[PDB]
Design a binder for this molecule. Structure first.
Ligand SMILES: CCOCCOc1cc2c(cc1-n1c(C(F)(F)F)nc3cc(C(=O)O)ccc31)C(C)(C)CCC2(C)C
Ligand SMILES: CCOCCOc1cc2c(cc1-n1c(C(F)(F)F)nc3cc(C(=O)O)ccc31)C(C)(C)CCC2(C)C
Ligand SMILES: CCOCCOc1cc2c(cc1-n1c(C(F)(F)F)nc3cc(C(=O)O)ccc31)C(C)(C)CCC2(C)C
Lengths: 206, 187, 193, 206
């Protein structure tokens, strides 16, 4: 149900400060997931497993799509444009370049729309490879329903681009490797945790 | 030893040269694509080959060897995310071939002279794969997508196999201890 | 359970900066360089503190709360935890490393002239030299029957550096939370109205 | 000790395994010439070489490269320029070798006796896992650094901080060693041109 995946997308666009910002960011993911058809019908254990397996790729996909508007940076939560400032301070320039060249610029060149992003995120959420699912068949079947619905949407809205569905799915490998590299280099810790630590230390040091 | 990797690399280059339009790319870009792809291309082949084998991988290697060498978790990922999914859907050699060609034609590879050209060759392969799945399995309209959606698992299993030196560690501590002992016992 | 943990991190960070400001000449460095030194060092400085604190305890570490190596091994950071016990804690115990010696080692770590982006690494090196000359003088006068003691102290710094790196890589502190508290945090979020 | 440690110092993917074999053998020949190393149980000798090989190689090529303000000399006398490192994807780790090891060896004019003793200290690593008698390895380490201290005090009595300064390069060696394994520093720098040229040649005849 492609209208309802679009609806989920739209509703969502000290070092305690760092824990708080992480809390908020994670909660936005959970609110979006609860609005995806049939997610809330899965056993709660499996819902937890899916959000733990997906949270990282789901955030990256959102800020990558948000950054289409902008040249040579990404827009995060709390509205902030990052060029190579927080990026360069955190030493995550290489990961930033990967986001711009593999996700942002490809989303821009094909004019990926919010329905398409929504469906890709729902596919990532319904990950039947996630370790310890009670019923991966049930998760695979929800994934199938999302991509069948995505294919139908692309064929109706962009019938002159018969390769578009495949092109969307073929961003998911780049999302998976950028997701892994973001965890390896603590991309999230460093970007949430740059200015609150720096300003806190500077003030105490006077 | 290093010989088996040499052989495996040669076989890979022979396979790539036989993929339509690969040899038309600038030689620099062909080198970049093989360097960017070799790891996922090999994992995809031995994963598909291991359909034949009960609960291990053929290169043969069962979970005990994996867990003893400290790479049990990565071994389980290969069986559950690649081997068993290839088995359950009866992925055929044509489908594996097209998936490997898609991996080879990776337009994200760093330093390509013309990534648009590589994306266009990728497009030609997956259009051809879609046509094949639609004709051979017309009662499975989700099959094309299901094939493409093994490529994220291949990407992460590829990265984890490099990180943990999966293949080196499967050789074990004994051969390396033996190699050092032989060096030590020189005059 | 999780708010308690973010609070104790706040406290621990405050304590670190108060300690650094009391190290001779630290506060004379350009503020940018002071920030760089604390960002480059905080991890090894904390590991050194809890390692020395843990001398009293068998096969766990005291934070400031006891953590036993069972929690480490269950959370899958067992090997890094055992490196803390065998490479730092037990060596600190066997040589009876004292608080002056730990202080000097931490001051050496703080004054790291390798830290990237220092305006004047030569100035940081010169402060490091003053600390280790002062440590050597202390070891020679307080323990003159142990001529190897100064060297033994400095030769724990490689183990601190590798343990520090491995603690970041494998998210040692996050993983010591356990899976159950994070699963409980997500379950609470999922059950909100 | 110190005269004999100085004496030890002074003495197509197959082609990359061959160069690694040679490089590793040079390490083992050097270790066998360190006093009392060959008296250790053979198992412990293997454990010490497995635990040390990486830091022992980095220390040697770092000291060798004192001559050069660019790059590193790789035993044969072959210069590897910053650009080859950055092109082969290990630029960051290469800059860490030049700034934290090479330039600091140059600033203090570390001599071959001092390098020999540092390498002997690294070899006699009592933290190495599974040693039959770590106490025996610790005692050999202590004898090396006592001997190094006596050498520094006699040869450089005007530099009282020299012994400490030598030992304080060992943390940089440990972190650069770990980063060299993570990024396959050795494979990539020995291996970059040999693979690229091999592939280009095979790719050129249909
Ligand atoms: C379900 C797992 O958490 C999902 C979102 O991430 C966090 C969440 C939280 C945290 C950190 C993070 N956190 C963060 C953060 F958002 F930057 F803080 N990055 C993380 C990386 C990993 C990992 O690489 O395995 C794990 C957790 C990370 C802390 C530990 C701050 C406590 C509050 C919670 C639960 C909100
Ligand atoms: C009591 C221990 O004292 C503090 C130890 O350090 C941590 C502590 C914590 C955390 C992270 C870390 N932590 C860690 C960790 F080691 F990976 F856990 N990496 C961090 C990076 C930053 C940053 O780049 O700004 C900030 C904090 C990081 C999280 C965010 C997991 C919350 C809870 C606490 C205490 C465990
Ligand atoms: C220029 C440096 O030369 C010494 C390298 O040591 C080796 C030695 C050997 C090998 C690999 C390596 N080898 C190499 C290498 F040199 F590129 F070859 N890098 C290695 C990394 C690890 C690790 O991270 O755990 C382990 C072994 C590694 C192989 C295992 C392939 C077979 C036997 C030998 C002798 C050749």
């Amino acid at each position: 149900p492609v209208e309802r995946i679009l609806e989920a997308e739209l509703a969502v666009e000290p070092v305690t400060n760092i824990c708080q910002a992480a809390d908020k960011q994670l909660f936005t993911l959970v609110e979006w997931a609860k609005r995806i058809p049939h997610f809330s019908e899965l056993p709660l254990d499996d819902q937890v497993i899916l959000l733990r397996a997906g949270w990282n790729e789901l955030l990256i996909a959102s800020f990558s799509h948000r950054s289409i508007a902008v040249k040579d940076g990404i827009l995060l939560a709390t509205g902030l444009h990052v060029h190579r400032n927080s990026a360069h301070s955190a030493g995550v320039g290489a990961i930033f370049d990967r986001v711009l060249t593999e996700l942002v610029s490809k989303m821009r060149d094909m004019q990926m729309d919010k329905t398409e992003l929504g469906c890709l995120r729902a596919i990532v959420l319904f990950n039947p490879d996630s370790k310890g699912l009670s019923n991966p068949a049930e998760v695979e079947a929800l994934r199938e329903k999302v991509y069948a619905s995505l294919e139908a949407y692309c064929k109706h809205k962009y019938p002159e681009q018969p390769g578009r569905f495949a092109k969307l799915l073929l961003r998911l490998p780049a999302l998976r490797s950028i997701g892994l590299k973001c965890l390896e280099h603590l991309f999230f810790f460093k970007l949430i945790g740059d200015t609150p630590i720096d300003t806190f230390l500077m003030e105490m040091l006077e």
